[PDB]
Amino acid sequence: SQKHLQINQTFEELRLVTQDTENELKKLQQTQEYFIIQYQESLRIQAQFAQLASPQERLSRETALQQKQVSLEAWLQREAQTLQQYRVELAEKHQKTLQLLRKQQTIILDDELIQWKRRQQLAGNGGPPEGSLDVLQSWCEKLAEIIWQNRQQIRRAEHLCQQLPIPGPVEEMLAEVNATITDIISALVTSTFIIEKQPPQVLKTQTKFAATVRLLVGGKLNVHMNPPQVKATIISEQQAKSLLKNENTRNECSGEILNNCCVMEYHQATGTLSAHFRNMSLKRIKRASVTEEKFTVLFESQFSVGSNELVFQVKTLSLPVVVIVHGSQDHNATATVLWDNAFAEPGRVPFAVPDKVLWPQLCEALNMKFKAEVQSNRGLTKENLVFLAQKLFNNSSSHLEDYSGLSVSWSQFNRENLPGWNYTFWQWFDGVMEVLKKHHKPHWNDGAILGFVNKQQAHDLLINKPDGTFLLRFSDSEIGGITIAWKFDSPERNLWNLKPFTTRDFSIRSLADRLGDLSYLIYVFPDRPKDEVFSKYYTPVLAKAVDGYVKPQIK
Ligand SMILES: CN(C)C(=O)CCN(C(=O)[C@@H]1CCCN1C(=O)[C@@H](NC(=O)c1cc2cc(C(F)(F)P(=O)(O)O)ccc2s1)C(C)(C)C)c1ccc2scnc2c1
């Protein structure tokens, strides 16, 4: 990888300095224990002076006992300042380790984890998959091991201090180290409670749904031994906003979810601690445009780490969800989700989005969504984007760079209607994706549908072509309509436009079968023979058993 090597180098340095301070601490314990024994030897001198009944040998033993006393008192005094100096040195080393650790955690949590979440958010719009949490968990486990080893080293150092107090700067250094450890652990625990698999963002009521919540530090802390219950709740955008500023009622919810409790399972030979909610269902939704109303599944859990007196209340909000009830609401609910996933700013307050965006930014969102909806690598070309910009901005320019600095508001996108129509831009664009997705994925993928050309453009492309040359185009006046533009010289007219076919027409007779019926359609623009493009789709009429055919037979 690239910057991942520097992260791994910092982990190896943190591992080394943590081992060094463990070695210094064992030495500090031994120095203090030997000092305690030597202090008791100085008390043993005074008892020895009271044990000389004896006659002439009393003077010889007294002079030696006094010399031992002088040397031991001088040793004890030097050792007391050595104990002091080593405590300060150990505390300075712990401070240094915690500062390097804070910088490393900042990279993992505010950079790498945020990028993974942004990829997850964009995947909701058709973007490339976030990928596995394997390296994030591997990094978080190391942060947990290093913070924990350092915490138990400083608690051992504190215990040596309470057993043999030496007043001075050490107490303030230890208080500062304890405040630092407490901040690192809380940030790590609260930030590694993440949603691995988001619930659906266009959420239909009474529909079984799933979500997976994982705790990246579960394996390396005392959490997997007593796996906590995770509770899912649906809350409104306002309730989510109040929860973030801690100004909430502690129970506010906007509906009920069935099978909303789940105990995290620990998977050994992976180290993963996760709650797999597989059978959730929105039983009811409480409402305050319904299709613009955002909710979030709040996941919350409470667990302790290593000790009774160390409990965390973790909370994580899913990506905003639009709740629907009928299915016909999915199309408008999708626009709200699309704009949010694409244009949410980092560090925003629960579910704020920019009012307007630049046309190239919207292009990137529509192309991503289009490719995922039609399941093709054939997305929106520069010419398709120009056609869409012309429809949106009511502009004539055929140059994509002329739209680069133009902005599109949420209202121009899915509120106000296009120039002379009773529909919005999004309704039209989603009408195209829906008619393609429903019946024409292989035709779109094959290049059989030009689509994003206007009536005048189709006219100019077909004028000088042989009779019977045609193209398939998206209708301007009918949502989800596909119209045939064709050239065929006749006294009354040479360039023709067929009345659009919609999903109802396609359900009665497929596009390819209708094209096969029209004998005046001979070449698909530019020069491809019709049967070469559509014959694989023609229906081979099958005889029926009700008509006496005992075996499958084509008529
Ligand atoms: C009758 N059967 C069985 C057929 O399939 C034959 C084809 N057919 C027709 O001939 C229909 C019947 C009425 C006239 N007609 C036409 O096609 C005639 N054309 C038309 O009636 C029209 C052409 C356009 C083009 C657009 C447009 F370009 F897409 P837009 O971008 O929105 O401006 C919009 C509305 C119309 S109405 C034509 C060929 C001049 C004769 C037709 C076409 C589509 C449908 S959908 C349901 N019935 C039909 C019938």
Swiss-Prot record:
Annotated GO MF terms: DNA-binding transcription activator activity, RNA polymerase II-specific; DNA-binding transcription factor activity; DNA-binding transcription factor activity, RNA polymerase II-specific; DNA-binding transcription factor binding; phosphate ion binding; RNA polymerase II cis-regulatory region sequence-specific DNA binding
Gene Ontology biological process terms in this record: activated T cell proliferation; B cell differentiation; cell surface receptor signaling pathway via JAK-STAT; cellular response to granulocyte macrophage colony-stimulating factor stimulus; cytokine-mediated signaling pathway; defense response; development of secondary female sexual characteristics; development of secondary male sexual characteristics
Biological role stated in the UniProt entry: Carries out a dual function: signal transduction and activation of transcription. Mediates cellular responses to the cytokine KITLG/SCF and other growth factors. Mediates cellular responses to ERBB4. May mediate cellular responses to activated FGFR1, FGFR2, FGFR3 and FGFR4. Binds to the GAS element and activates PRL-induced transcription. Regulates the expression of milk proteins during lactation.
PTM-bearing positions, type Phosphotyrosine: Y537, Y549
Superkingdom in the source lineage: Eukaryota
Protein's cellular compartments: Cytoplasm; Nucleus
Secretion signal span: none
Keyword Transcription regulation attributed: yes
Keywords linked to the UniProt accession: Activator, Cytoplasm, DNA-binding, Lactation, Nucleus, Phosphoprotein, SH2 domain, Transcription, Transcription regulation, Ubl conjugation
Boundaries of every SH2 domain copy: 444-541
Protein name: Signal transducer and activator of transcription 5A
Record lineage: Eukaryota, Metazoa, Chordata, Craniata, Vertebrata
Family label: Belongs to the transcription factor STAT family.
Phosphoserine sites (modified residues): S54
Record text on subunit structure and interactions: Forms a homodimer or a heterodimer with a related family member. Binds NR3C1. Interacts with NCOA1 and SOCS7. Interacts with ERBB4. Interacts with EBF4. Interacts with CD69.
Gene Ontology terms: cellular component: chromatin; cytoplasm; cytosol; nucleoplasm; nucleus; RNA polymerase II transcription regulator complex
Post-translational events: Tyrosine phosphorylated in response to KITLG/SCF, IL2, IL3, IL7, IL15, CSF2/GMCSF, GH1, PRL, EPO and THPO. Activated KIT promotes phosphorylation on tyrosine residues and subsequent translocation to the nucleus. Tyrosine phosphorylated in response to constitutively activated FGFR1, FGFR2, FGFR3 and FGFR4. Tyrosine phosphorylation is required for DNA-binding activity and dimerization. Serine phosphorylation is also required for maximal transcriptional activity. ISGylated.
